[PDB]
């Protein structure tokens, strides 16, 4: 769990919000994603079927309705959110090594910039999820008219309800993280002056 | 096992009940879930079949009768139950770091609040399991009339008896945990006055 | 292997029988179960076939003849047998922590009670295995008349001979463990007076 | 993560660019590849289908259109890029062992040569990717006329859009790495004189 | 590798033969078994087919011709061969603990008895392999007349040649181990007098 | 990576060639084999198809044309090449233990003998690969006339081009290793006199 707290963004300049609350939500998102990755999204494409005899209609309809899986989006979001924290950690390690082989304001500014970048990454991933999948709920039946499917065909999604439940969990966690990051930057600015 | 005892909620203010009994039941639930996750619930959907020629009826009937798998419910319950313990642990680490870089009542109140939250999470997960699956036993044959299935169709469940056995084990463990948490809060309150 | 010896029940009051013989048999059972879990019992249900055209007869016949797999029974037996040892270990750790932050008879009684509980768990699992599967051998062909199968159908089991061999190994190991536990309690009682 | 930073090429003569920026991009590429390896490229061939009754046409068309998978190309690129860094590390360990059992310019020249070799490997892998797959986007339908397929047949690709997204990510990361390596060699040369 | 050398039977009374040669062959057998377990024996039963329309003939013929897989036999042989070494190690640990909380001949006799038991286990497993599979080579086609197969049917084995190669490797390694154990006991007896 | 360098054959008498160059090539071969084992050779037999209705022709033709897979050959080669290095390491550990409980020429001769044995193993595996697969390239279509296939049938290979690429990589690495071993023995002999 120490690696997870390192990836969260725990810093010596971090207050209680960034040190005890943000890291726990980060670990919670990691655990939920690990639980839901291959158990419920594993057969998303192999169990996707359409009512037709046309060869190749299943693959094109699946690609049309799921340009990128929810799990891959969440994985990319977690990686990009954790990147600035380890960037700051490597910078601190470099500074300590330089000190050993031979200010605090630079650390403070680096921390606030990294928090701002985390907030931006979370916001943009929320926006792209809203663009791709406007509704938080997943439906059982979809209508597909992409070539080579003739006219319109009915296709059926695997495990819509369980996927909806996990989507609600993940979106709520992301929203909480956004609120906590905004509170963190505001608190740091207030403490500065 | 040390990580498991940390996730259980072992604290310096914990009595014998919370330190030697609750953690063991937590580890027992973890081990049973690990044993039963993919061995018996792995083919829940791929082996689910219905007596019909209608395309898409298997998937919609499976989604209707199993909105969320038992294993996923137990995994979410374990994650949410273990969250407050590591929240308390991170708060203790933060307090110790603050002391290093420069009371007991706060620790006591944090511990009692975390125990209450664990009790609430266990109770709400028991209630939601009762709502979704009223009977502890799983049946071999189910009747499905969801669109697009015509009229009513017969569908067959994989491994009903083994799933019933593991459900009984998990429910008994959860009930024991609830009783132990109630005893813990009562004992702490009694020792307080 | 140290974790396995801890799970066996090695204690400072343990004699040679409980310290050098019981733990080795415990590790042997763990290793045999790990070898045989998914190699030979992996396709128990997917390769189970019956001579019929009736939909759903394979699943109901498999559920009728295998209410719970042998591997899951052995896993549950190992978990329940190892539970009292780690309960005792956690109690000892709690006692030592209490001593650090500030008798032998309590340890002796706890050890004998844990050994008795291990003996009881092994005996009850042997009895339930005898109830479910009276014969140690597994047959190639079974006769199934459960609804919806019409009349009686023939069904065929995967790898009967290899499963029989591993069943003999596991039963012999369990019997040896029972005998050793009885010898342990008798020896401790004799040394007491 | 320490092994990853070692494989990146962190050296005592490295500046900030090579120590805190290049290593993070290396770890980012590793993580994205781990996420995308078997999740989205796992069923590239088993789900590849063509509209024909000719036996063997699926395999020959897949081999014609995908001589080597994107994931394998990226894996080989990462291995070859990380080779000179560990070569330098082993040379440093050998030099230190020789010193223990009994100049800086040799280390400086070895570092600059290793950086040049990393730049060359990244450039050649970019060029070979451009040769094999000129467009960054993947199409849904391809036309195949390789023997034994009669005339021309239509074949359908699995998950074109998700693969396009991950390809864009990987190409952008590789370009950033190339730019950073060029900046590193230029900065080292400038500091030399 | 330290655990492997412990399982081999390295003891303070061991000579060069038992300390540097037997352990290497043990590790070699472990590595070859790990390589060949699921790569070449993984599809032994799923790819086994017979030329018939009779339901259930494939399973009964496979069970008749392969009562227990070669890989499972080798796994059991390795476990049973490694058991006496860890029994001796646990006895030594028990003796040292007894010394700490408060002769060499006992250690010498325990070592020679354990070597004899290892020799016996290897010999009996060689004999049982000879009984089950008289020829070291595996054939492509087998003739099966077990009920319910009508008359005699032809069945085909997966990867006969690769399995033959690995069988030759494993048998040669086992024979070398037997010879080395005999040399070890003879050398110890000679050194005794 | 330390275990890999130990398996390479790094010794206190090793020069730069054996200490910094041979070990890197060994690790490179290990990594390439790990990447290519199950990704590209995983479906070698399940996707192998022939244009016929004869039962059992696919398996016999696959066995005829691929007596042993390339990946298994490379795995065996790596194991046998790494065996003498760990034999020498265990001999050194035995010598140091003997010294602790109570010359350099023996170490020198052991090192040169181990290098010669590594060279011999690499050469013989190269020769056997040349015998089994004379051409470095793999073809799409093969002609099979083994019983029970009637007359001659066409069979199709999975991923010929990617397998050719990885074969070229592995053969080049093995040739480099052979050249480096010859240079090592020549350099040691020259330094001796």
UniProtKB/Swiss-Prot annotation, chains A, B, C, D, E, F:
Consequence recorded when altering residue 72 to W: In CMTX1; localized in the Golgi apparatus without reaching the cell membrane
Gene Ontology cellular-component terms listed: connexin complex; endoplasmic reticulum membrane
Extracellular side: 43-72, 130-167
Spans within the Cytoplasmic topological domain: 1-19
Biological process (GO), any one: nervous system development
UniProt keyword annotations, A-Z: Cell junction, Cell membrane, Charcot-Marie-Tooth disease, Dejerine-Sottas syndrome, Disease variant, Gap junction, Membrane, Neurodegeneration, Neuropathy, Phosphoprotein, Transmembrane, Transmembrane helix
Subcellular location(s) of the protein: Cell membrane; Cell junction, Gap junction
Major localization class: membrane
Subunit structure: A connexon is composed of a hexamer of connexins. Interacts with CNST.
Function recorded in the entry: One gap junction consists of a cluster of closely packed pairs of transmembrane channels, the connexons, through which materials of low MW diffuse from one cell to a neighboring cell.
Protein name from the UniProt record: Gap junction beta-1 protein
Primary gene name: GJB1
């Amino acid at each position: 769990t120490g690696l997870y707290t390192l990836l969260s963004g725990v810093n010596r300049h971090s207050t209680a919000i960034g040190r005890v609350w943000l890291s726990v939500i980060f670990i919670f998102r990691i655990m939920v994603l690990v639980v839901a990755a291959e158990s419920v999204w594993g057969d998303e494409k192999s169990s996707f079927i359409c009512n037709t005899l046309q060869p190749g209609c299943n693959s094109v309809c699946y690609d049309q309705f799921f340009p990128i899986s929810h799990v891959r989006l969440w994985s990319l979001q977690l990686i990009l959110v954790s990147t600035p924290a380890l960037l700051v950690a490597m910078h601190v390690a470099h500074q300590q090594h330089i000190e050993k082989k031979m200010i605090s304001g630079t650390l403070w500014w680096t921390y606030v910039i990294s928090v701002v970048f985390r907030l931006l990454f979370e916001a943009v991933f929320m926006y792209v999820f809203y663009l791709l999948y406007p509704g938080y709920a997943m439906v059982r039946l979809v209508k597909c008219d992409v070539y080579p499917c003739p006219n319109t065909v009915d296709c059926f999604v695997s495990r819509p309800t369980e996927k909806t439940v996990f989507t609600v969990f993940m979106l709520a966690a992301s929203g909480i993280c956004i609120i906590l990051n905004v509170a963190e930057v505001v608190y740091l600015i207030i403490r500065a002056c």
